[PDB]
RNA sequence: GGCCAGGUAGCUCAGUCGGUAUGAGCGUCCGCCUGAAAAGCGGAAGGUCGGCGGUUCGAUCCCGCCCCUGGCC
């Protein structure tokens, strides 16, 4: 879209009008281009060829039958009294053409080597070559037809075909649509070289043409945008005119094919100045050309027969029978030069860059001239442009000039293109760089683009060049002076940052908690945001699940992955597929990262105006307008948890591991949490639960459910955890322990509880009855034997009791014991075993 | 400083989120973080997103 | 594949009527016992969290 | 955006323009074997041939639309 190919012959040329003999190597010039801010893609260069490799014609064709697809045996014309008679395949060409030829002993691109060869029983004394074997141009379905003049047989090939020159692939900035043009590249090495600049559109390259009288009737309306519009004809071509090789050349080595010298020299001009033109067939215009937009479901035919649905932003050019151009696209079939054209009206505009863009992008027409337009046209050129494609046109087609010009540049016309001047003083850019530059070298530099300089004292008024409507503001002036003094010379001074305050407690909690997963076993992965396909119907979610809410990509790269994620398991479990399906079976892997959580349909903000501060309501209001994006962990396991070893055969994976996961969390995140069954797909009803910071839930954890495992592909057992860290506090805590000195005391306390009794609440009704006695609690059997009976479990704590001011006595711990066996009797319904 | 209708804007190809028209999209850079600092920070301002 | 092209219609139509009768009652009991599956995953499978 | 090429087992890939993919290599499982293994030998399981419809008695195969990669401009 922003491609610029030129070839360097014709680069040199342009700078050489102002600059005689300047000729830089291909290396010092793509370094140059890159120093002032122009990208080189790449660098090209032509052929290269050695040996006989000459012009030839094509004297005599012999069809050579009998074969798959057919074969010429051709006698070729190489300057000699001697005709070579050469076998070639192509079709593309008749008796008398001009050829290009490779004869035994030639070197073609690259290291292959021509010689007489024996094919289809005939005696082939070299070979034809096409566009591509000769590393001039991407043509291969025939071979290089020279047209008519370009040279006589005999020329030295590498000559004709300028194969000694290079083809620089320039990616031009949005912001300098003028070097999408020789003119404007010229210019830009004219200014890197410190050279004098002979402008290729001025007057004195292009002297104007006579202008006695109106060229075609023009009503122009101004709301359409479009700042100038002219018109000019070149009458009495000749249709039988081929361009000459020099411009077809030129063309081809640009990325553009020709066609017809009518289309050639508009094609061309473009290329040399920076102004898109157009020729229409004069005679197949049918009264007032008018520019307007186009009505609601309008339709236009462009000149490649494909028929476009235009919009009211559309900008037309019409007559009385039908559309003739879309405005800065391409133009019509209508009005299209054909083959038998005589007589050609040249369309020189400036079209609105917006318009342009807006139209271009609608239709999927990136044309070359729709890309110049929307990175702005220079609007004083127009006329240049105009008579230079008449005056070249009317010499090669044979034509005529015609004397009349229509010049619409405005309603009151406009005869100044000069953008608005800009007041900035003459330090501004030794301040922005941090370099002293010399006298007068914002001036001078600023004068080089093009610009008017005057000086009030020690402020400057700059006046930019109508091929840069880019320079707005001093910001746009310190740039052209910093990018032509050259980057390099800024000197590298370390800014004075004030003592900052380091990682939040939220950046640092997700530095820890990401530490302790790790060296818990855990591998951390990026979760894609984009959700797997039917996802959450594989996970049996109901329909109104918060989950299933989600904000879709409207353009995402898989159209069956729209929507963001509302949970990090998706991705993690996609994850867990790719490693356990490629041999890795015993993995945990983990991640934190932030999920998309609307709180209802997709709703914007209309467009604040930049010039001003956005006030903190309308700052409220564009944070309310986004969805709810917490800060979530999560992780997943499946296989062996603990791998075997010559201490055992391992242990597999099971929800307890995603369980230790929660507190591994907890404990980086030094807060307390508390586990309870819960019932939340895609986990296990029996084996999930649910992880709460004092009452706030966060998130859940356990095994997943075997169905959602089944529907999912997953491995069997397998487990996962998510939590909202957003919903967990950040905590500070200050202990102050107080180290007692007294031994302690040793009990176990058996308590038989029913089965659906959590361990946990047994252990919270023992600590709230022993008191502060209490130092340990630590749960280490769980039986279940048949002597404890159906449904029912028995727990046996170990209880460490101490006091911090004595020695207590087994009355003492048993008196604590006791109360703690009566809590756990009135809260969970203990018995004490016996 | 994104311009409407160019290509400076309209090349830089955006994840929108749908429907069309919203003015809602994935960031393409991290620089938005940059505007909401000088929003609610005071200057000066050395911020890392 | 084997039969003459002449009784391919006829028994090839009898042939798809009784796998499908098969495949039916397959449909219909692996949803059955995937529902009982469902039903009793919770109890049978229960663990303290 | 047209015309081709493709999406095939857990992985990497063959192969079929109508009724069995007598699929390969590796991966999974069983036996002989070992204290337990692997290799070796002997064997099995697993694909609804990209998705949704259509034609047909019957579609990986033919038709339409759509999704995803490659070639091509
Ligand atoms: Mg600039
Ligand atoms: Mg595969
Ligand atoms: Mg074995």
């Known amino acids: ?834 | 400083n994104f311009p409407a209708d160019h290509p400076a804007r309209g090349e830089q190809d955006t994840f929108y989120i749908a429907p069309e028209d919203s003015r809602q999209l994935l960031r393409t850079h991290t620089s938005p973080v940059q505007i909401r600092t000088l929003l609610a920070r005071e200057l000066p301002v050395y911020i890392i997103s | 594949a084997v039969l003459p092209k002449e009784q391919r219609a006829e028994a090839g139509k009898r042939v798809n009527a009784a796998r499908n009768a098969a495949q039916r009652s397959y449909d219909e009991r692996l949803a059955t016992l995937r529902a009982e599956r469902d039903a009793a995953v919770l109890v049978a499978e229960g663990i303290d969290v």
């Open chain 1, 1 to 834: 879209s922003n491609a610029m190919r030129l070839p360097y012959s014709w680069l040199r040329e342009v700078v050489a009008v102002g600059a005689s003999g300047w000729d830089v190597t291909p290396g010092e010039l793509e370094q140059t281009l890159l120093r002032i801010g122009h990208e080189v893609e790449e660098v090209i260069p032509l052929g290269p060829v050695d040996g006989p490799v000459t012009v030839g014609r094509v004297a005599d064709i012999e069809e050579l039958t009998g074969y798959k697809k057919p074969i010429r045996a051709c006698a070729v014309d190489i300057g000699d009294r001697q005709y070579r008679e050469i076998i070639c395949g192509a079709t593309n060409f008749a008796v008398g053409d001009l050829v290009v030829v490779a004869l035994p002993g030639a070197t073609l691109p690259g290291g292959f080597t021509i010689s007489a060869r024996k094919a289809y029983g005939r005696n082939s004394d070299g070979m034809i070559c096409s566009a591509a074997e000769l590393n001039l141009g991407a043509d291969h379905s025939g071979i290089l037809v020279l047209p008519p003049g370009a040279a006589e047989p005999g020329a030295d090939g590498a000559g004709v075909l300028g194969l000694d020159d290079v083809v620089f692939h320039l990616a031009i900035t949005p912001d300098r649509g003028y070097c999408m043009s020789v003119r404007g590249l010229a210019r830009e090495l004219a200014c890197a070289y410190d050279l004098d600049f002979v402008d290729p559109a001025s007057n004195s390259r292009v002297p104007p043409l006579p202008i006695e009288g109106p060229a075609w009737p023009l009503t122009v309306q101004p709301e359409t945008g479009v700042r100038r519009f002219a018109l000019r004809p070149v009458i009495g071509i000749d249709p039988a005119a081929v361009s000459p090789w020099w411009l077809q050349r030129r063309l081809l080595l640009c990325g553009i094919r020709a066609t017809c010298p009518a289309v050639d020299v508009t094609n061309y001009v473009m290329l040399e100045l920076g102004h898109p033109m157009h020729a229409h067939d004069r005679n197949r215009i049918s009264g007032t050309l008018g520019v307007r937009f186009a009505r609601s479901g309008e339709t236009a035919v462009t000149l490649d027969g494909i028929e476009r649905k235009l919009d009211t932003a559309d900008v037309l050019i019409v007559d009385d029978a039908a559309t003739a151009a879309i405005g800065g696209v391409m133009g019509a079939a209508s009005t299209e030069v054909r083959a038998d054209s005589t007589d050609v009206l040249l369309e020189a505009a400036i079209w609105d860059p917006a318009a342009v863009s807006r139209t271009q992008r609608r239709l999927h027409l990136p044309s070359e001239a729709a890309r110049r337009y929307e990175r702005t046209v220079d609007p004083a050129i127009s006329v240049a442009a105009l008579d230079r494609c008449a005056r070249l046109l009317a010499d090669i087609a044979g034509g005529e000039v015609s004397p009349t010009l229509t010049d619409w540049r405005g309603d009151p016309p406009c005869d100044d293109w000069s953008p608005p001047p800009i007041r900035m003083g003459v330090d501004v850019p030794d301040r922005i760089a941090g370099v002293a530059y010399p006298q007068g070298t914002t001036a001078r530099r600023l004068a080089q683009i093009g610009a008017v300089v005057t000086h009030d004292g020690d402020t400057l008024t700059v006046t930019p060049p109508s091929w840069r409507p880019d320079l707005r503001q001093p910001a746009d002036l310190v740039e052209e002076v910093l990018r032509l003094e050259g980057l390099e010379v800024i000197p590298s001074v370390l800014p004075p940052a004030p003592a900052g305050r380091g990682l939040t407690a939220g950046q640092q909690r997700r530095r820890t908690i990401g530490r302790s997963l790790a060296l818990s076993g855990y591998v951390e992965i990026l979760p894609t945001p984009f959700l797997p396909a039917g996802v959450f119907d594989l996970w049996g979610l109901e329909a109104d699940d918060s989950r299933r809410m989600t904000t879709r990509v409207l353009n995402p790269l898989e159209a069956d992955r729209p929507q963001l994620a509302t949970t990090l398991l998706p991705a993690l479990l996609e994850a867990l597929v790719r490693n356990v399906s490629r041999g890795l079976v015993d993995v945990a892997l983990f991640a934190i990262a932030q999920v998309v959580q609307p709180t209802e349909q997709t709703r914007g903000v209309g467009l604040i105006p930049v010039d001003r501060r956005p006030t903190d309501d309308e700052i409220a209001m564009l944070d309310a307008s986004l969805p709810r994006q917490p800060q979530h962990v999560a992780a997943v396991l499946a296989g062996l948890r603990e791998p075997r070893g010559p201490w055992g055969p391992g242990r597999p994976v099971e929800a307890a591991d995603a369980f230790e996961a929660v507190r591994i969390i907890a404990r980086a995140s030094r807060v307390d949490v508390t586990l309870r069954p819960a019932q939340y797909l895609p986990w296990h009803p029996g084996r999930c639960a649910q992880v709460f910071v004092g009452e706030s839930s966060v998130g859940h954890a356990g095994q997943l459910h075997p169905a959602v495992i089944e529907r999912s592909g997953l491995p069997k057992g397998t487990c996962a955890v998510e939590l909202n860290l957003d919903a967990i506090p950040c905590s500070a805590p200050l202990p102050a322990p107080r180290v007692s000195p007294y031994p302690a005391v040793f009990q176990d306390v058996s308590l038989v509880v029913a089965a659906d009794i959590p361990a946990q609440a047994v252990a919270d009704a023992v600590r709230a009855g022993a008191g502060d006695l209490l130092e340990d609690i630590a749960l280490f059997d769980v039986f279940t034997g048949p002597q404890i009976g159906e449904h029912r479990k028995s727990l046996t704590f170990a209880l460490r009791f101490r006091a911090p001011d004595r020695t207590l006595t087994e009355d003492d711990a048993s008196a604590a014991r006791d109360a703690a066996v009566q809590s756990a009797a009135e809260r969970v319904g203990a018995v004490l075993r016996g």
